[PDB]
Amino acid sequence: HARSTGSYSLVTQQPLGGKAQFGGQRFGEMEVWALEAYGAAYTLQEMLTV
Amino acid sequence: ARVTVQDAVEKIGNRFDLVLVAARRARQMQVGGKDPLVPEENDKTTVIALREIEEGLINNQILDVRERQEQQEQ
Amino acid sequence: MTYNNVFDHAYEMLKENIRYDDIRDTDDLHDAIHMAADNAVPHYYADIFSVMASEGIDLEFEDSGLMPDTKDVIRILQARIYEQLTIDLWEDAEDLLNEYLEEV
Amino acid sequence: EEFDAIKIALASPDMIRSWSFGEVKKPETINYRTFKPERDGLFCARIFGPVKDYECLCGKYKRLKHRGVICEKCGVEVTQTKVRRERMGHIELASPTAHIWFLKSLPSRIGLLLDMPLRDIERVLYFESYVVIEGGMTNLERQQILTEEQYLDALEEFGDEFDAKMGAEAIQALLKSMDLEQECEQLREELNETNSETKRKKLTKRIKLLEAFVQSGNKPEWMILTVLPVLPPDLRPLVPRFATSDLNDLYRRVINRNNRLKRLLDLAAPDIIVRNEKRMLQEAVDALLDNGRRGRAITGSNKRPLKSLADMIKGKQGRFRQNLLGKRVDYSGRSVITVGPYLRLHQCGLPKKMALELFKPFIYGKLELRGLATTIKAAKKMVEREEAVVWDILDEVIREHPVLLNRAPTLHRLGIQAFEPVLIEGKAIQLHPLVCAAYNADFDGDQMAVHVPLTLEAQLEARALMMSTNNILSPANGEPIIVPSQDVVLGLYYMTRDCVNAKGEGMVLTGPKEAERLYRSGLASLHARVKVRITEYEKDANGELVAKTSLKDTTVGRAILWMIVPKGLPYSIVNQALGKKAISKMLNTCYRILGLKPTVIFADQIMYTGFAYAARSGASVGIDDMVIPEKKHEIISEAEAEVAEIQEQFQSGLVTAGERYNKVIDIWAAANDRVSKAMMDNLQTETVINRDGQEEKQVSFNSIYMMADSGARGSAAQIRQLAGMRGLMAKPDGSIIETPITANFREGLNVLQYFISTHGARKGLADTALKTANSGYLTRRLVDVAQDLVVTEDDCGTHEGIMMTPVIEGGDVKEPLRDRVLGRVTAEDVLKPGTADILVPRNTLLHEQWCDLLEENSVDAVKVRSVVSCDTDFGVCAHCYGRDLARGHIINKGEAIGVIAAQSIGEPGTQLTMRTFHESSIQVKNKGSIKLSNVKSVVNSSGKLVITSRNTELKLIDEFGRTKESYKVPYGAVLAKGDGEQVAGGETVANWDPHTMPVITEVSGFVRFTDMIDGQTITRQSSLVVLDSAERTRPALKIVDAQGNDVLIPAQYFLPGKAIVQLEDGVQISSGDTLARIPDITGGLPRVADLFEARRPKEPAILAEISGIVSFGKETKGKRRLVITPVDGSDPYEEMIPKWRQLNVFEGERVERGDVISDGPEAPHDILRLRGVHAVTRYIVNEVQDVYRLQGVKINDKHIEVIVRQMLRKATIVNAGSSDFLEGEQVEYSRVKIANRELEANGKVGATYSRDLLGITKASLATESFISAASFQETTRVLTEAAVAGKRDELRGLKENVIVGRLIPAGTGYAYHQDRMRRRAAG
């Protein structure tokens, strides 16, 4: 599954994932810590806002 | 093409400010101010800026001089 | 016996009852706290007076409705220790309810 | 509109009264008039906004062409999200308001301030006719609780000067009149007046809570909740069904109770029914705010409420409730793993079906710029019809773009790596074979995730900071990284294996011409003992190549790989069999010499030649490849005969059960070791085909021996398990079952033997099933304890160093010194190979040249400019960590060292098998003279010198200057070698058992009176025991010198328990005699989470001072045992021990501040307060490293040391401080105040030093801020304490900038954060 500009839901400002082609793993705190450990976190700031 | 930036780690003493230097170079390379000296073989403007940093023709000091001479000519 | 070992055995029996019952809600946690303070009581009289002699306890209490009216001293002391254990197991099981849900 | 600090507290009610609007009185039903709920009902029309682009709330004015008009029916305006901060519903309701911050949270704000017990706080409701407000002629207390009849009597007797209210608003009538500035000073004077157990237990902390509340600057009258705040429906989740497990149930309950209250207050109802309606209104309101309050048990479905009004901030107590939960990130996907071994380390693949919609706006922008698609609809017609132009744009974009790949379980930092995509037919991504084992993900159906970085700086950090060509030397391990397994090592082992009888033997030929000869015909790859041309380059100057040529004896495949080998490398790494360790050390040498780019290119070429020659090599196993040993059945028959004869003598009656058990263990171990040796020496020399010698030992052509000798994954245990016997292995403990199992995979197994095999397999799977919760929960606490770390200093400047003493035991070193030299930077006191000089100017990096310099010197241990000690008073510095990442540069400021350190602890502990399976002399293995250091030597009359001490250390200078032999002798041993006697190794120097620790006497003379009794201390069937402490329970004192002399002219005479001492009374023996011979679930655990919980040992040790003379009285007294003779006598300080181990404090063990281990391991509380910080730190690091070397997984010492530094929080400072009297104070906040006490030069302002152990779990769940340390916490009890205390956060922690979201101070943006330092301060 993959989704670039797919239809979003109003529940906590995130897509659902089911019933259609919506990709993206649920970005948990472990991958937050993996981005926090190594080089920098501009990728985190640009993927948590826009 | 632009695998490792180890030459800038050897030249410039830090590699974390190197990212800010490379972004400040790449935005000026993609908007305007200087023609690309490296031809577009298979790369974009940020990769050309990173290769120009890897060749050793730009750092924080050269970009500070460039920013001051662009703010002076206005 | 001391207050710390009796309290450790108290929330040990409480967490064993939680692992046996699989309790998630706080309103179902409170009844387990009351049943665990009903459990884990000492039958040695010297240990009962050693809980009253150790630290972390006061003579005056907040509620007087749970204080019985009889000539038995051990019933009044057991009610006071039961109220203190319910309060302390609530205060140190509010975190344990989250800890058990975060273990498994 | 910027922001610097975030402070949450209870604001003034005047802003709520200025925002007083709304009509939420009656619960009218939802009508379908204007496609939305109407006025004065469910979802009343007051606080609505436009549900479409531009509208009114009725079908009225305020079109988009006109702005700034006050509405007719409502009071809303044209603009959005600014009126909504003013139009909120603030209606007065339920004057007996809820005080759940005193109910749900454990401290009480309104209760402890007005001197109100918790039972009265729980009994505010169902009340009995008011509380008397104080006045002029009032007699009773202002907070006196009376009944209804007593309040009626007080009302009819008081009369004048009495103003009271009906409900619980009267307390508010006190709090409106509370201008109190007197009672808190009386309470703090009462707290400083007396100090006992009735003030420590829940009075001191609430007194300090009132002290923090009165000094916060906020008014107590701001705590009055006059109105009920109503959230706007536009900001709440909109629902026009409309009520399906949501807020609407309690919403309509509260509005219905409000309607009943207003109706019975307008119709003048009697007091009982309106009292019932007010208590039902309060039961609605407090359940609307915070559920439970230790009552109102949950029924289940919609008849009982589920989501309250404050349940939006936390609906679930797990991991995803409003605290920045896992958001479904767009421009991403999920993909299935395979492998394509035809691209470089920088190149990878990506499916066509995913990548057609990962770059939609890029293709749209290129179609707009090239001038082919003038509109966006034409761009859709070009993309979603798949014309060749968007295929060319897709080929242009995908060729140069970084794409992140990661795993959905990500417990390493190596999981997120950027690569370059390639259009590959199908819809499954491949994973690069030098990446697959780093993710710890086999090809068993695991699923990866694909991410697309979208900015300039994100692509630059993906191409510069996070890929596989810049993550080398494994910072989670500190060991070699990725050399492949089972294919590349197999191919490079087959093509470089020497063998006799080659086709066309002994050819002289150049380098590349062997590939010319091999490809056509008539040449084998084995090619032993042939000298050909080889060109080897060396480097001696500053990166200068030396052109050399040579004639060397080698094979075909080694000389073909020599072209694959780059210019400057040694030759001795080629002549071996080239197994996995040989390729690993070759990669280590080329990474050490040639840099990073040549070793990446050379590892790429190793991958190329391995997966290109694995097809040429050919692996094959079959029915004849498994070699059956010809001597197997004879060994099985003789072992069965030996076991049968020994069990015949067992049932005869000569052997006990445990003796039969140990005999079964070592005899079946000898049996399957004989089977292993039989299959080995029948497996070696099978091939005898040769030339010119006609008999030669040659490596066999079987595959199993080649995969065993390769050493990639094939070990010796699997080798003896396949062709030999399986063995004897039990389920619970992995024990050896006495039933004979002599099966083989070549024959048919028995039913019960395969049943014991599946016992073992199911027990192993039940042991490996623990790895989920062990790894998922520990790393949570390990990262959450290391959140507030901002590295911001490069000039550290410390004086106290750490003595790096290794854990060296035996002749050969187990943990060497070379791993401790690299990384950290030593202090200014290190020495040359010359004697008594200096080596550093105090700023020198340490790697292989300086490692050789610190190896050739004569020193046992050096001091290190390092962590925790004095900390520069500005962040954590940089010389404590040094270089542990892929780059050899110093880790500078602004890098998250602690987040790397937390994930580098139990990386693959995972409890591999059976919870890591959990002499009678002192034999030496190294030569050198033995010099007794810190050993009380007592001259014995037998001619030897016994050891009457417990500490034993020795420095050895034989080949290296560092020591290689310590051999800590237990207390009470007989040393067979004197002080200064040369030993040759392999000889017992101490003729005493290490399991027994007796007490050797110090003085000769007459025996202390310890006369026997029948059955108390003696056992009769010299060998006449006089004292037994373990049987009676000590009644023993210091013995005399000769007859009756005191011991004042140059510490207690001891005897062990349950022993028969051969020395009787009246024997007059000399000094130095030795007394009698009589003196798994813990080690299987990883032992990491229990140290973070600050665990308690079983028995603590005895602490004393320099005056450490000990003595004992009778057996027992009125107090506890062992009333201490030291301490008390010079300084009044007593200790009480109910029961512990036997006392071992004597004259041989010197007792000072920080006493040695006497009765078990002492807790690190007193060890940190009394011994030191670095001693507890090194002890914790050595214990964790001992557990990890028992497991078999090497970890980093710096990471464990940073974790121990994070365990050092929550100290209690000295009482000579400013508002400080045995208070738990932050350690960093205490060491900020060093300069304030130094400039003022007063000991009353600040304390001297403090350090306490107090738990890492408590330090991780209670931090400086309230946003952080709130994931694994309850949000309400933290927010109420933050609102009462009035504590801000200043936006500095890492978790704070994760949850809120700013320029994070870790990484490349910290300088941008320092731009904020250039923005606020002097900007």
Side-chain angles (χ1 to χ4, degrees), chain A residues 4-10 14-18 20-22, chain D residues 328 330:
Chain A
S4 66
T5 59
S7 66
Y8 62 96
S9 66
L10 294 174
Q14 63 182 357
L16 294 174
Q21 186 177 2
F22 290 102
Chain D
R328 300 293 179 90
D330 291 331

Side-chain angles (χ1 to χ4, degrees), chain D residues 170-198 200 202-206 208-220 222-238 240-241 243-256 258-281 283-293 295-301 303 305-320 322-412 414-432:
Chain D
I171 303 298
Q172 293 179 356
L174 295 174
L175 189 55
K176 291 185 288 293
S177 66
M178 184 176 177
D179 291 331
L180 187 144
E181 290 179 353
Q182 296 294 321
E183 187 178 1
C184 294
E185 289 84 3
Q186 185 178 2
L187 290 174
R188 70 183 67 189
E189 287 179 353
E190 186 178 1
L191 183 63
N192 291 116
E193 193 270 330
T194 184
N195 286 315
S196 65
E197 65 183 1
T198 188
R200 178 66 178 86
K202 298 297 289 183
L203 273 73
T204 303
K205 62 184 289 184
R206 67 181 181 179
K208 292 179 72 67
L209 183 64
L210 267 68
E211 288 179 353
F213 182 74
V214 73
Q215 294 297 109
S216 66
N218 290 318
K219 294 181 177 67
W222 292 352
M223 294 187 288
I224 302 167
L225 294 174
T226 61
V227 297
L228 191 147
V230 178
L231 294 174
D234 198 2
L235 295 173
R236 291 182 292 173
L238 183 63
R241 294 180 67 250
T244 169
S245 70
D246 55 355
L247 183 60
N248 291 318
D249 292 331
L250 292 174
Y251 183 71
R252 67 177 62 89
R253 287 178 182 176
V254 168
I255 298 169
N256 195 1
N258 193 1
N259 194 3
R260 298 292 184 184
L261 181 65
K262 294 297 289 183
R263 185 177 65 85
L264 272 73
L265 287 173
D266 289 331
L267 291 174
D271 187 74
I272 300 169
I273 306 169
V274 300
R275 180 178 179 269
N276 291 318
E277 288 184 352
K278 284 177 71 67
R279 65 180 292 167
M280 289 299 292
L281 178 64
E283 185 68 28
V285 168
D286 63 356
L288 183 66
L289 294 174
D290 288 328
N291 291 317
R293 47 95 61 217
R296 189 181 59 83
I298 298 169
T299 306
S301 66
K303 64 179 73 175
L306 294 174
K307 264 63 186 299
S308 67
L309 192 145
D311 197 73
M312 186 177 176
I313 193 166
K314 181 179 283 186
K316 273 78 69 177
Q317 293 180 356
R319 292 183 291 114
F320 300 101
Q322 194 65 41
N323 296 115
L324 198 141
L325 76 160
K327 294 181 184 292
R328 300 293 179 90
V329 178
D330 291 331
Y331 294 93
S332 296
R334 290 180 289 117
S335 63
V336 181
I337 307 169
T338 187
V339 55
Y342 64 96
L343 297 174
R344 68 180 65 250
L345 186 62
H346 192 272
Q347 192 67 252
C348 183
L350 190 64
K352 288 173 69 176
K353 299 295 187 291
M354 184 183 286
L356 58 88
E357 61 185 0
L358 289 176
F359 295 100
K360 292 290 184 68
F362 292 99
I363 295 169
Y364 291 164
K366 293 291 179 68
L367 288 174
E368 289 292 327
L369 287 174
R370 290 178 66 88
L372 294 174
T374 61
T375 60
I376 305 169
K377 188 179 289 293
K380 291 183 174 68
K381 291 187 287 185
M382 288 182 182
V383 170
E384 281 83 4
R385 293 183 295 171
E386 293 180 353
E387 293 179 353
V389 178
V390 303
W391 287 102
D392 283 328
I393 297 300
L394 191 67
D395 291 330
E396 185 178 1
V397 171
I398 284 178
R399 179 65 179 87
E400 192 71 27
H401 190 275
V403 173
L404 291 171
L405 299 177
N406 53 2
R407 191 179 178 181
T410 305
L411 58 93
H412 294 287
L414 293 171
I416 301 170
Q417 291 179 357
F419 295 100
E420 293 290 327
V422 169
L423 281 80
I424 297 169
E425 192 271 331
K427 60 189 290 183
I429 201 168
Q430 81 273 20
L431 189 60
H432 186 75

Side-chain angles (χ1 to χ4, degrees), chain D residues 866-882 884 886 888-890 892-914 916 919-921 923-929 931-946 948-949 951-954 956-961 963-1012 1014-1017 1019 1022-1032 1034-1038 1040-1046 1050-1077 1079-1080 1082-1091 1093-1111 1113-1118 1121-1132 1134 1136-1139 1142-1145 1147-1166:
Chain D
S866 66
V867 241
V868 86
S869 66
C870 189
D871 277 329
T872 318
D873 204 0
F874 184 73
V876 231
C877 4
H879 289 87
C880 66
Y881 184 73
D884 204 4
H889 189 270
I890 304 169
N892 54 3
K893 64 182 181 180
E895 184 177 1
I897 294 173
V899 186
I900 301 169
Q903 293 179 356
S904 65
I905 297 168
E907 348 93 56
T910 68
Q911 294 297 108
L912 293 174
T913 174
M914 291 181 182
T916 183
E919 293 179 354
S920 70
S921 293
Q923 184 178 2
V924 299
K925 292 181 181 180
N926 194 1
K927 296 183 290 294
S929 178
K931 296 183 290 294
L932 294 175
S933 178
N934 198 0
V935 174
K936 183 67 180 294
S937 179
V938 176
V939 176
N940 194 0
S941 66
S942 179
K944 276 78 176 175
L945 294 174
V946 299
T948 61
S949 67
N951 194 0
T952 299
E953 64 183 1
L954 182 61
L956 279 74
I957 302 169
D958 292 331
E959 182 68 28
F960 290 161
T963 184
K964 295 182 290 294
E965 180 179 0
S966 296
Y967 287 166
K968 184 178 184 293
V969 178
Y971 183 74
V974 178
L975 294 175
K977 299 293 183 182
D979 185 74
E981 185 177 1
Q982 183 67 41
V983 69
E987 185 178 1
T988 62
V989 299
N991 194 1
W992 186 253
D993 293 331
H995 292 171
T996 299
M997 293 180 183
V999 177
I1000 299 171
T1001 186
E1002 295 292 327
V1003 69
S1004 176
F1006 184 72
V1007 180
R1008 180 66 178 86
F1009 182 74
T1010 175
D1011 188 75
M1012 295 179 286
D1014 195 1
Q1016 184 177 2
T1017 188
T1019 301
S1022 179
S1023 178
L1024 185 63
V1025 63
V1026 297
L1027 182 63
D1028 194 359
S1029 296
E1031 186 178 1
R1032 295 163 173 245
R1034 62 150 82 238
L1037 294 175
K1038 180 62 67 68
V1040 298
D1041 290 332
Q1043 184 66 41
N1045 195 1
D1046 197 0
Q1052 186 180 3
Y1053 183 73
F1054 287 159
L1055 282 81
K1058 296 182 290 294
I1060 301 169
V1061 176
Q1062 294 179 356
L1063 295 175
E1064 65 183 1
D1065 195 1
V1067 67
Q1068 295 298 109
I1069 46 93
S1070 296
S1071 178
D1073 290 331
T1074 304
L1075 295 175
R1077 189 180 295 274
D1080 291 331
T1082 301
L1085 294 174
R1087 294 179 67 188
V1088 179
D1090 56 355
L1091 294 174
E1093 289 290 329
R1095 63 178 291 166
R1096 300 292 295 165
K1098 296 183 289 294
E1099 293 89 6
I1102 297 170
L1103 192 276
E1105 290 183 354
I1106 300 169
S1107 179
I1109 298 170
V1110 296
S1111 178
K1114 300 295 187 291
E1115 294 179 354
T1116 185
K1117 293 182 289 294
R1121 293 177 64 88
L1122 294 175
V1123 175
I1124 42 97
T1125 308
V1127 205
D1128 285 331
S1130 66
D1131 193 0
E1134 68 271 14
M1136 182 179 72
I1137 297 169
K1139 186 183 286 185
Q1142 68 273 16
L1143 184 60
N1144 290 318
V1145 174
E1147 293 179 353
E1149 291 177 350
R1150 184 176 179 179
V1151 177
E1152 66 271 14
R1153 300 293 293 163
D1155 196 0
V1156 298
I1157 295 169
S1158 179
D1159 291 332
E1162 190 176 1
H1165 294 281
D1166 291 331

Side-chain angles (χ1 to χ4, degrees), chain A residues 1-2 4-5 12 14-17 21 24-27 30-31 33 35-40 42 45-46, chain D residues 326-328 330-331 333-334 357 406-408 410 414 455 461 783 896 900 903 1294 1302 1306-1309:
Chain A
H1 294 88
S4 66
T5 59
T12 66
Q14 63 182 357
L16 294 174
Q21 186 177 2
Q25 187 61 256
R26 182 176 292 172
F27 187 70
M30 297 176 74
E31 294 179 354
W33 294 347
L35 290 175
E36 186 69 27
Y38 283 167
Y42 279 101
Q45 183 65 37
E46 292 294 327
Chain D
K327 294 181 184 292
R328 300 293 179 90
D330 291 331
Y331 294 93
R334 290 180 289 117
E357 61 185 0
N406 53 2
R407 191 179 178 181
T410 305
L414 293 171
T455 35
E461 291 174 355
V783 179
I900 301 169
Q903 293 179 356
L1294 295 178
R1302 289 182 67 190
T1308 61

